[PDB]
């Protein structure tokens, strides 16, 4: 499927490249186009200004679902506008929120269902993490793993996502969360910047600053396993790459492209 | 070729670990032990402080040596107390202030014939980044290089060496400079920890955090030749080390030991 998936706080009041390209892949329409505020406990200033930048940028049919308790989540209407639309974008908040109101109901499978047609699903912030199968959950001293991880929707299927990438800790805690499955690629995206997942499994860089890929394939060896709460984390051979607007990866040989 | 690189805030108060290992390196002050504080606009203070620390630590023979002239590094009285001491300790401060004031005199070359018969070298803050061929310079935006480099002593001739490396941006100024020439070893030193280099080209991690080691080798790609000032680094294959207390590395083969 199709992904874009965002760092935070991206620009809603300029030029909004990453959130035109969003409505450019959902058509600017043509069928419904779906703002999910379910992270948020504000969910009624979140979805007026994700519905007027979305209005700014062209697209007319925007329904905002208010989807806050699990019996929202498992309302038929909901199932159908989401497996209808042209797209879906969910807003920032808590990622545990997501997941223990959208998880085992209705409107999960109607994501689901939408992302295997080729809906475009995006996200930002609390809505960029839920999109890999285990997340990363928002206490980060730093060298060392205080990390807390949860299962997430699982569209990305080997991959954890962090987002505001430029935040103290968030490297290190990326690196533990690799350390501790290098199965897993590390995505960090910085604030204003995502990336925009195709299909054939590569992905390009769109905004402001760049996203940190952490592969751990390469790892020789590391402690995390033996590792105290208060102890430092050693880790030897990580293989970073560091991609701003105008490349992209390949995600099935873990290859750095330039576009 | 003795070297003890320390990242600066080293504990001056409680177990001192660092220090201590550079108490016993120095035999104690059989031979006289000498404090360096060109680096500092604070020689007193900051001279008087590592006097009683080291004093406390048992090294009976100790000098403070307040350089801070040309005049005062060109004299033979000064030569002669490096050359003849078992060890010489480097404090913080500016590194400007040490290459600009001792470089070309007297008291460089006498630090380097020390160095080369053996004699401890040891030098915290600016008195560890001045170690390398090429140092950075102290004056930060993120994804961005706006770094600064300038000759140093070159005791340690391929590695860059980047201190109080937990601060914000340390990470990507250090990784611009392994970029633009990946020949050189990026070391970023935490605070209160340290690297010990013994004469085999192989150095242990001293203290309470972690040693970032940043491999350029192993780098595919990079656009830092083409990059404007407010542009966004890219680098691909960039090989990353952590290494805290126990672990070391062999700079030859550039590969992580366990101690």
């Known amino acids: 499927g199709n992904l874009v998936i965002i760092g935070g706080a991206e620009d809603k009041k300029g030029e909004s490249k990453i959130l035109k390209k969003v409505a450019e892949i959902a058509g600017f329409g043509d069928m419904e186009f779906i703002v999910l505020t379910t992270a948020t406990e504000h969910p009624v200033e979140v979805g007026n200004e994700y519905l007027n930048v979305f209005q700014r940028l062209g697209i007319?049919?925007?329904?905002?679902?208010?989807?806050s308790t699990r019996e929202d989540a498992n309302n038929e209407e909901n199932y159908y506008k989401i497996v209808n639309s042209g797209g879906v974008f969910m807003t920032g908040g808590d990622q545990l929120?997501?997941?223990?109101?959208?998880?085992?109901?209705?409107?999960?499978?109607?994501?689901?269902?939408?992302y295997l047609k080729g809906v475009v699903i995006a996200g930002t912030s609390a809505g960029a993490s839920v999109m890999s199968n285990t997340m990363i959950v928002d206490n980060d001293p730093a060298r060392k793993c205080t990390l807390k991880?949860?299962?997430?929707?699982?569209?990305?299927?080997?991959?954890?996502?962090?987002?505001?990438?430029?935040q103290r800790g968030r490297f290190g805690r990326?690196?533990?969360?690799?350390?501790?499955?290098?199965?897993?690629?590390?995505?960090?995206?910085d604030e204003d910047t995502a990336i925009r997942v195709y299909?054939?499994?590569?992905?390009?860089?769109?905004?402001?600053?760049?996203?940190?890929?952490?592969?751990?394939?390469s790892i020789v060896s590391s402690n995390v396993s033996e590792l105290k709460p208060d102890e430092i984390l050693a880790?030897?051979?990580?293989?970073?790459?560091?991609?701003?607007?105008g490349y992209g990866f390949d995600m099935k040989r873990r290859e750095v492209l330039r576009l």
């Open 174 to 189: 990326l690196l533990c969360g690799v350390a501790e499955n290098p199965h897993m690629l590390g995505i960090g995206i």
């Open 149 to 166: 991880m949860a299962s997430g929707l699982g569209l990305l299927e080997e991959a954890i996502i962090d987002q505001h990438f430029d």
């Open 235 to 245: 880790i030897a051979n990580v293989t970073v790459h560091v991609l701003p607007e």
């Open 60 to 67: 007319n049919n925007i329904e905002v679902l208010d989807i």
């Open 199 to 217: 299909p054939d499994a590569h992905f390009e860089v769109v905004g402001s600053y760049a996203v940190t890929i952490i592969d751990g394939k």
């Open 97 to 114: 929120r997501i997941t223990s109101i959208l998880g085992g109901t209705k409107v999960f499978n109607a994501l689901i269902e939408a």
